[PDB]
Design a protein around this ligand. Structure first.
Ligand code: MET
Ligand SMILES: [Zn+2]
Length: 544
């Protein structure tokens, strides 16, 4: 029995959960649910990423404390993830005492071990507000084309890129004051000292090939020291012994994985598991599910931080691509930038979980939610292949056989074909080849429906003296449904609950080896209804 700690990336507290977040959290949750079904000790950990200058400024503009704002968004996020049945064992915050203490500890160890350097830099500063300006809080006139009202390091009219210090007549986005260059001492993490260690990790074959290829590009460009401090005013953790200095959000954010696990252990009264999972000698496995925009932090800074502070490193990184809708990046004007909360007003969680799972693989390629295909695939696969095996057979069992399934399998060979597939399907879930698993499951569903078609229960049912045959056929179909729903249990939690209620049994991975014989099932109302394009049109309209 393995010990496994799985995370998803920590969502920022200054925006709502959308379908891009949901791709990642669904992918991880399917994997986690499968690992639990195979008997492992699994800890599925997340948290909101609650620090930084954008969050501080947003709270100020709303006239509330950052603490109030992040608390509201934490509740909103957790409500949405709960609505998709994301099965976290703990959902915490980077703004927490556990993360403060662990961030201070890691920084102190890195500093004692020689990996922290102090250097003065020059940066644009708003002297009226009294704060250093990140690039996107400087606006001005493009030096190339002279277009006004351009933000940061690029012009949205002519496409030019430049340092914000080249903007003509620059203005602070916060106050409107003219910014000036000002010096400040910053603290830097000496990432280059870990180059050889990180190159050996890249070559080991654990990482996705596409991720290893990106790493080689980054080694070729040259690793640099990493600026891990920000000046007051800031919403974050103060640096010990450095008044007016704070840790940059991205230093504390991955430490938040550790902080969330520590919080879970502490709430459970468990004084041993934190060190069992995070010490250098750990035999537990640690996996981070992340998107391709945040690889650098997780594959270079983070393993180096851990190595330099005497903690174990990730076992693997599992990186996914971006979500597209109708083939294109989500578009607010077209109504394809869809919030998780909006989704649930129109469709259930299982439909999106299924669709994403059917498209996902172990590679980093983008995943397209084609809304026409979504309707067609949910209806074809869930309603007409899988649920059909229950719905077409359960009525006869309940009405003519008192709910009782036959005492023997009508076609034991066919049943064995279904149970023999468990090894390949389980390996597909394990390896994150979700689309392969779904293809295998649906091929079996096709075989099951062909069996029922070949036996023609709608004929047998009207023919005198054929009650035993009818019960046999319908019971066989229900047993095939039991197996298919076991394979899909990681994917479709709510349908699975309805299936378990109908079947009067919890679905376990090994349970499929004992078919339901001489066994009472319950009646049900529709296990899963069809969807249509009018609902898609409503979703898009509601998102504009
Ligand atoms: C430690 S993962 C932090 C992820 C970051 N909040 C993001 O959304 O990209
Ligand atoms: Zn320009």
């Amino acid at each position: 029995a393995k010990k496994i700690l799985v995370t998803c990336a920590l969502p920022y507290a200054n925006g709502s959960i959308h379908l891009g977040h949901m791709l990642e959290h669904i992918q991880a949750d399917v994997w986690v649910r499968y690992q639990r079904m195979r008997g492992h000790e699994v800890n599925f950990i997340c948290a909101d990423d609650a620090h930084g200058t954008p969050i501080m400024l947003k709270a100020q503009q709303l006239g509330i404390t950052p603490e109030q704002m992040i608390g509201e968004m934490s509740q909103e996020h957790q409500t949405d993830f709960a609505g998709f049945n994301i099965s976290y064992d703990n959902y915490h915050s980077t703004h927490s005492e556990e993360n403060r203490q662990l961030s201070e500890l890691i920084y102190s160890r890195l500093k004692e071990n020689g990996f922290i350097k102090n250097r003065t830099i020059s940066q644009l500063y708003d002297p009226e507000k009294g704060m250093f300006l990140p690039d996107r809080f400087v606006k001005g006139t493009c030096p190339k084309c002279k277009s006004p009202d351009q933000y940061g390091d690029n012009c949205e009219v002519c496409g030019a890129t430049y340092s914000p210090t080249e903007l003509i007549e620059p203005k602070s986005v916060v106050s409107g004051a003219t910014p000036v260059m000002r010096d400040s001492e910053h603290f830097f993490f000496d990432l280059p000292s870990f180059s050889e260690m990180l190159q050996a990790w890249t070559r080991s074959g654990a990482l996705q090939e596409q991720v290893a290829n990106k790493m080689q590009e980054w080694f070729e460009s040259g690793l640099q020291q990493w600026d891990i401090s920000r000046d007051a005013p800031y919403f974050g953790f103060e640096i010990p012994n450095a008044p007016g200095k704070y840790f940059y959000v991205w230093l504390d954010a991955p430490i938040g994985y550790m902080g969330s696990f520590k919080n879970l252990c502490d709430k459970r009264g468990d004084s041993v598991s934190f060190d069992e999972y995070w010490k250098k000698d750990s035999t537990a496995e640690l996996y981070h599910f992340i998107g391709k925009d945040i690889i650098y932090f997780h594959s270079l800074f983070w393993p180096a931080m851990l190595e330099g502070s005497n903690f174990r490193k990730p076992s693997n990184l599992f990186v996914h691509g971006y979500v597209t809708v109708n083939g294109a990046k989500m578009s607010k004007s077209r109504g394809t930038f869809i919030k998780a909360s909006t989704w649930l007003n129109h469709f259930d969680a299982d439909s999106l979980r299924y669709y994403y799972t059917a498209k996902l693989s172990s590679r980093i390629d983008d995943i397209d939610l084609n809304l026409e295909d979504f309707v067609q695939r949910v209806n074809a696969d869930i309603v007409n292949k899988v649920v059909n095996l229950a719905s077409r057979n359960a009525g006869f069992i309940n009405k003519r056989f008192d709910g009782v399934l036959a005492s023997e399998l009508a076609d034991p060979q066919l049943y064995k074909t279904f149970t023999d597939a468990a090894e390949v399907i389980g390996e597909a879930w394990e390896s994150r080849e979700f689309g392969k698993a779904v293809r295998e499951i649906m091929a079996l569903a096709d075989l099951a429906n062909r069996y029922v078609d070949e036996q023609a229960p709608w004929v047998v049912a009207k023919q005198e003296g054929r009650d035993a045959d009818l019960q046999a056929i319908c019971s066989m179909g229900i047993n095939l449904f039991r197996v298919l729903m076991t394979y899909l249990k990681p994917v479709l939690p709510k349908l699975t609950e309805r299936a378990e209620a109908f079947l009067n049994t919890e679905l376990t991975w090994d349970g499929i080896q004992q078919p339901l014989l001489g066994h009472k099932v319950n009646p049900f109302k529709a296990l899963y209804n069809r969807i249509d394009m009018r609902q898609v049109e409503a979703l898009v309209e509601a998102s504009k």
